Amino acid sequence: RILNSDGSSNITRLGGWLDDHYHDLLTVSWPVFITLITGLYLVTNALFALAYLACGDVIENARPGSFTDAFFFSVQTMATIGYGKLIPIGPLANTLVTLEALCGMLGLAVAARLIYARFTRPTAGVLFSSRMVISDFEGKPTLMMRLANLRIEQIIEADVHLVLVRSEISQEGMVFRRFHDLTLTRSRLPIFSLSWTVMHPIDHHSPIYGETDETLRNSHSEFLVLFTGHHEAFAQNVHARHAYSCDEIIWGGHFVDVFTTLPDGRRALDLGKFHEIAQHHHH
Amino acid sequence: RILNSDGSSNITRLGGWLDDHYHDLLTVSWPVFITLITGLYLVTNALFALAYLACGDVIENARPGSFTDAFFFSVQTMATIGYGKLIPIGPLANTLVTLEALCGMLGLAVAARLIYARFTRPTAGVLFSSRMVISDFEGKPTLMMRLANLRIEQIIEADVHLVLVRSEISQEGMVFRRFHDLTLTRSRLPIFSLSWTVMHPIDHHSPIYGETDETLRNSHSEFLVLFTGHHEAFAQNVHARHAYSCDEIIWGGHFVDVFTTLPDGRRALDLGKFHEIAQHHHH
Amino acid sequence: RILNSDGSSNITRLGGWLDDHYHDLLTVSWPVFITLITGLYLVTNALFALAYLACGDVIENARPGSFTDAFFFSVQTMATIGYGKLIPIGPLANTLVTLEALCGMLGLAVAARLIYARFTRPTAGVLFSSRMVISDFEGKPTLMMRLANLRIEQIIEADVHLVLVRSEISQEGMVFRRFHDLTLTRSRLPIFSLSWTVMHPIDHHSPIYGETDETLRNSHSEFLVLFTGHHEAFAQNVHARHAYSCDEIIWGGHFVDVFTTLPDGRRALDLGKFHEIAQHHHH
Amino acid sequence: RILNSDGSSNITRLGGWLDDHYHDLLTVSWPVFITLITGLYLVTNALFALAYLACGDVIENARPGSFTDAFFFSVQTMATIGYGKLIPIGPLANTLVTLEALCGMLGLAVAARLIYARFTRPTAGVLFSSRMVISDFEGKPTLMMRLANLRIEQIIEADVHLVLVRSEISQEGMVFRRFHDLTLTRSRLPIFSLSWTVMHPIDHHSPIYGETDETLRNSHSEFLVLFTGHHEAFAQNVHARHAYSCDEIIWGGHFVDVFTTLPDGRRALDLGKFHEIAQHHHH
Ligand SMILES: [Cl-]
Ligand SMILES: [Cl-]
Ligand SMILES: [Cl-]
Ligand SMILES: [Cl-]
Ligand SMILES: [Cl-]
Ligand SMILES: [Cl-]
Ligand SMILES: [K+]
Ligand SMILES: [K+]
Ligand SMILES: [K+]
Ligand SMILES: [K+]
Ligand SMILES: [K+]
Ligand SMILES: [K+]
């Protein structure tokens, strides 16, 4: 497989610590992110502790020269707790308190907004069919796959972009992976609530015209699907990607109706039937 | 009705606690959201209270072994109030204070940003006409519905996507709901301030060409409308959806002019006339 | 004038307190917004003051029954200042402190995020020419207007949508304002840095084909311009709107080159020349 | 060069302090931004210090008339530290504390949200080839340039807009820079993971049809590239711009394959080969 089932590439890649700070703060794992924020919080409070000590004995009820007492006073100042046992003395420590309160209020507000950004990533909650089918629709062979909304809230302006990716030999003897846009009957669904079957009519303008299971395997053909939409639950845009290889196309298959009948005779959506494909079996 | 008047589906659906945390935090009711935040706030302060107690008697002016005194000290630390009656003693409680201040400052900032997200959902403030009409416009039968901006602020790049949804029998005997895009005379209005009448000319390319009130009812025809736009009041995008059934089309009707004359002879917008449709009555 | 110079409508409009809370919190004036936030802050602290008093004398160093002492203790609790002169006594006041700290931390965080939203509205910083011109370009009469970027930072994917708005009589004797999209030579400028002249070639497909200054005045013709783009300074989308009446079209005029020569022989942009139009004067 | 390599213009520009506050707060340098926030923090605390003094001796444990003691009490109130040595006396200072806590909580929250906005600007992390090439592709001369994703995370709905910018003489003897959209074989790549070669087939509809290296230099031809896309790492849109002059087009050159073979026989992406162009050398 060139592309994984999720649509990402398998190709190995090659060719400063804070050179991409924002990206790294978002993509780094939660234990790493936590260590970074917690360590920065502790390192800043250790730097102010040393600063208070460099002024002399400028913290009331603190043991002279005690870093521990200066650190805990710094925490009480930076977090703006201010119990009042450890309190600043003179213009030097009060100036440092004024600087530290500002750093803590600003820096902890930024750290908290970064936690929120990492936490509020919306997921499309869209299910792609495990396979694609090739069967006749309106008297023409048609490539199909389907999507379902896994949530109760609607996706507005839902778009699907289907692309064929195959190996080709150019007119000047150049071997390369080419990307062919597959024209869909409907690429935009204004309101996506339940199930959507995406169709590519295989006409003389289709890059898979006259193609068989065998010819798709020789060009190492792959089908890449991008779904985009605005999700009403999040009041944000969402996307989902997927990839099918040549062996995931059921030639002559048709998708089973997902709309089932409940015991009370009601019409329901059964996503148990979502990956079910019907085929004709010969002797 | 397959689709409700708001554009949602009526179909019954089937086929972990924190498996969709962000969606559930946004879509859950306000009393439930409040119980969750308040309970998490109280449970965290109860966990730190127990932690302070596990260290021994490390809170000044607290009754030894008192959970109540340890809980209220935890609240005073986590909220960063720090009155100074209940104060930490030793390296163990001061370390817990340092950890608790961080959790509270970060966690309460995230909870507050989540309240803001739930509170700042923009509404389009767009009124859809209670009916659609079918009457001649520029010598051609035309399907129409109308929208009005209920607010003083404008919607920029306003888009309308009108779709017919009917039951159909495919060439291979497949019964299914098909979605037909209805081509509008104008689908984009760069600046939407007052009233907008949306028109679908019923020409030989229209899916409702040669269709009558009777034929629309036999295919269980429905009309789905999606409105999108950028709202100047919110400096955010907005949308609105609506649905009409076959019995909500006034055949031969025309919308009444909404621009009324005020006593001072001034031209005004009267949204009292917005749902008024004029029809010819025969003997 | 039907439409003002800024693109808004002049039409008079007609046809619950917290029924549109979010819109009203954004569009209300700053003195009103401030009164609302400040009053809510003061009313909440007065409600907790009364609550503390209803428990009895549960505030140390407070005068029994004093609302003033209970109010200032509430402020010290809700703002999380906690000096430590006024401190809570018993399980009742400590429970109220726990509730009040939560309300204040959450509610003041939301109020502050609302101030930021009202404060960070981006302006396009785009100058529209005071007039439009009609003159020959590539041997065809062309309608033109121009825009300039007033800032050093670029606007990416800049779009212009020009529309004619005139009064018309329909085939069934209906008088109405019709919106005609005016097709531009270029409606998209990927990178907008300096000046952009927008052109509508008046060909047989133009709604202003065969139109004169006189015929535009009889239909009360107006030209509405919408500019949209992504601003690099804000890393946000921006828009600007404008409107021209029939008397703001210079028939036969051409815009003066804005690129001037500086004393050091350097080529500069002179936005002093931006509204300058050249015309031929006859005897 | 009219346009720099980054796509910005070189043209010199000409033609109130808080007249563009939000833009200036985002585009101003970090030392300037810090001085502004820090100075505003210090000036506000100096104004409350003076206010407390104007009431008389209304701060316990403060030296009468001492601005230093009133300033540090103001810092302790505005930051909500509240140690409890300097505490307010009477209805006048307690009213000022109530006002100051509100200002500090709101104003410091806004300042912190502004730091976050300045800090969380996403970069596309896209590499443009140092040159463009003109060589035959599918038996037609084709203009090409290429882009690579410098990060592991994908860009979804990646768009490329290529424009020619040359000096031209109009039919009425007008010399001006004209912007020609160059039609690409593929302008949209739904999922951009590795390398993308952008192609403009030079057919009879191309503005560079029949053009040579010499004719492109006489019109001072430049090629402007805009890349846009949605970045999965940031869950935000991104863009990148670039510009090529006439001397940056390798006539007859073709880009070298970036997909290299690793010692374990694995296929890898070598961005060391990204700027490598192959050419035929004659005697
Ligand atoms: Cl925020
Ligand atoms: Cl935000
Ligand atoms: Cl096709
Ligand atoms: Cl049609
Ligand atoms: Cl035209
Ligand atoms: Cl072309
Ligand atoms: K505090
Ligand atoms: K405090
Ligand atoms: K305190
Ligand atoms: K205290
Ligand atoms: K805070
Ligand atoms: K104290």
mmCIF file of N, CA and C in Angstrom, chain B residues 68-102:
data_model
loop_
_atom_site.group_PDB
_atom_site.id
_atom_site.type_symbol
_atom_site.label_atom_id
_atom_site.label_comp_id
_atom_site.label_asym_id
_atom_site.label_seq_id
_atom_site.Cartn_x
_atom_site.Cartn_y
_atom_site.Cartn_z
ATOM 1 N N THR B 68 -13.301 18.686 56.367
ATOM 2 C CA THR B 68 -13.950 19.989 56.166
ATOM 3 C C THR B 68 -12.887 21.119 56.101
ATOM 4 N N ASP B 69 -11.995 21.207 57.092
ATOM 5 C CA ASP B 69 -10.931 22.197 57.164
ATOM 6 C C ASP B 69 -9.945 22.016 55.995
ATOM 7 N N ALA B 70 -9.606 20.757 55.643
ATOM 8 C CA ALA B 70 -8.709 20.457 54.518
ATOM 9 C C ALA B 70 -9.366 20.795 53.166
ATOM 10 N N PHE B 71 -10.713 20.613 53.062
ATOM 11 C CA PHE B 71 -11.469 20.905 51.841
ATOM 12 C C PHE B 71 -11.510 22.402 51.609
ATOM 13 N N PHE B 72 -11.817 23.166 52.667
ATOM 14 C CA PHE B 72 -11.937 24.621 52.555
ATOM 15 C C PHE B 72 -10.558 25.249 52.349
ATOM 16 N N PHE B 73 -9.500 24.662 52.938
ATOM 17 C CA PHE B 73 -8.146 25.133 52.639
ATOM 18 C C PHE B 73 -7.821 24.878 51.131
ATOM 19 N N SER B 74 -8.183 23.682 50.612
ATOM 20 C CA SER B 74 -8.012 23.314 49.204
ATOM 21 C C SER B 74 -8.764 24.302 48.313
ATOM 22 N N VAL B 75 -10.027 24.647 48.646
ATOM 23 C CA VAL B 75 -10.782 25.622 47.842
ATOM 24 C C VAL B 75 -10.023 26.973 47.784
ATOM 25 N N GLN B 76 -9.531 27.467 48.947
ATOM 26 C CA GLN B 76 -8.798 28.728 49.135
ATOM 27 C C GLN B 76 -7.472 28.740 48.362
ATOM 28 N N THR B 77 -6.887 27.552 48.136
ATOM 29 C CA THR B 77 -5.628 27.341 47.413
ATOM 30 C C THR B 77 -5.911 27.248 45.878
ATOM 31 N N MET B 78 -6.833 26.334 45.478
ATOM 32 C CA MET B 78 -7.250 26.117 44.091
ATOM 33 C C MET B 78 -7.898 27.349 43.447
ATOM 34 N N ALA B 79 -8.673 28.149 44.196
ATOM 35 C CA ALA B 79 -9.292 29.367 43.659
ATOM 36 C C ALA B 79 -8.315 30.537 43.749
ATOM 37 N N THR B 80 -7.168 30.330 44.465
ATOM 38 C CA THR B 80 -6.091 31.306 44.759
ATOM 39 C C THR B 80 -6.625 32.475 45.619
ATOM 40 N N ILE B 81 -7.628 32.216 46.507
ATOM 41 C CA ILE B 81 -8.173 33.240 47.415
ATOM 42 C C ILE B 81 -7.109 33.557 48.473
ATOM 43 N N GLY B 82 -6.734 32.538 49.244
ATOM 44 C CA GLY B 82 -5.680 32.572 50.241
ATOM 45 C C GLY B 82 -5.834 33.591 51.333
ATOM 46 N N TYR B 83 -6.931 33.483 52.103
ATOM 47 C CA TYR B 83 -7.236 34.357 53.220
ATOM 48 C C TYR B 83 -6.044 34.433 54.153
ATOM 49 N N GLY B 84 -5.527 33.275 54.560
ATOM 50 C CA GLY B 84 -4.369 33.241 55.438
ATOM 51 C C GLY B 84 -4.575 32.745 56.856
ATOM 52 N N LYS B 85 -5.789 32.250 57.199
ATOM 53 C CA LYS B 85 -6.074 31.591 58.471
ATOM 54 C C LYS B 85 -5.562 30.135 58.328
ATOM 55 N N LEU B 86 -6.021 29.421 57.290
ATOM 56 C CA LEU B 86 -5.567 28.064 56.964
ATOM 57 C C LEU B 86 -4.386 28.224 56.006
ATOM 58 N N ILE B 87 -3.172 27.868 56.460
ATOM 59 C CA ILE B 87 -1.934 28.066 55.700
ATOM 60 C C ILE B 87 -1.113 26.779 55.723
ATOM 61 N N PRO B 88 -0.309 26.474 54.673
ATOM 62 C CA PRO B 88 0.421 25.185 54.659
ATOM 63 C C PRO B 88 1.677 25.178 55.518
ATOM 64 N N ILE B 89 2.013 24.007 56.072
ATOM 65 C CA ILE B 89 3.198 23.783 56.912
ATOM 66 C C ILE B 89 4.049 22.666 56.304
ATOM 67 N N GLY B 90 5.339 22.931 56.168
ATOM 68 C CA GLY B 90 6.310 21.951 55.701
ATOM 69 C C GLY B 90 6.462 21.819 54.204
ATOM 70 N N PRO B 91 7.446 21.013 53.754
ATOM 71 C CA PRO B 91 7.665 20.860 52.312
ATOM 72 C C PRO B 91 6.584 20.055 51.594
ATOM 73 N N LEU B 92 5.860 19.178 52.311
ATOM 74 C CA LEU B 92 4.838 18.309 51.720
ATOM 75 C C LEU B 92 3.575 19.092 51.304
ATOM 76 N N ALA B 93 3.006 19.914 52.210
ATOM 77 C CA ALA B 93 1.810 20.691 51.929
ATOM 78 C C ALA B 93 2.103 21.823 50.976
ATOM 79 N N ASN B 94 3.304 22.417 51.058
ATOM 80 C CA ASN B 94 3.679 23.511 50.158
ATOM 81 C C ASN B 94 3.844 22.982 48.701
ATOM 82 N N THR B 95 4.326 21.729 48.544
ATOM 83 C CA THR B 95 4.460 21.054 47.250
ATOM 84 C C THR B 95 3.054 20.826 46.674
ATOM 85 N N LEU B 96 2.097 20.353 47.492
ATOM 86 C CA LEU B 96 0.690 20.134 47.117
ATOM 87 C C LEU B 96 -0.014 21.426 46.754
ATOM 88 N N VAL B 97 0.340 22.555 47.412
ATOM 89 C CA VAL B 97 -0.215 23.897 47.156
ATOM 90 C C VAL B 97 0.246 24.336 45.740
ATOM 91 N N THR B 98 1.538 24.108 45.437
ATOM 92 C CA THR B 98 2.208 24.419 44.169
ATOM 93 C C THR B 98 1.527 23.640 43.019
ATOM 94 N N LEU B 99 1.213 22.350 43.251
ATOM 95 C CA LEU B 99 0.511 21.493 42.304
ATOM 96 C C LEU B 99 -0.959 21.925 42.161
ATOM 97 N N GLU B 100 -1.643 22.193 43.278
ATOM 98 C CA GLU B 100 -3.066 22.555 43.285
ATOM 99 C C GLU B 100 -3.338 23.909 42.630
ATOM 100 N N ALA B 101 -2.493 24.929 42.885
ATOM 101 C CA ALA B 101 -2.644 26.256 42.284
ATOM 102 C C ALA B 101 -2.594 26.130 40.773
ATOM 103 N N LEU B 102 -1.620 25.349 40.247
ATOM 104 C CA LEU B 102 -1.439 25.084 38.822
ATOM 105 C C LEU B 102 -2.710 24.430 38.208
#
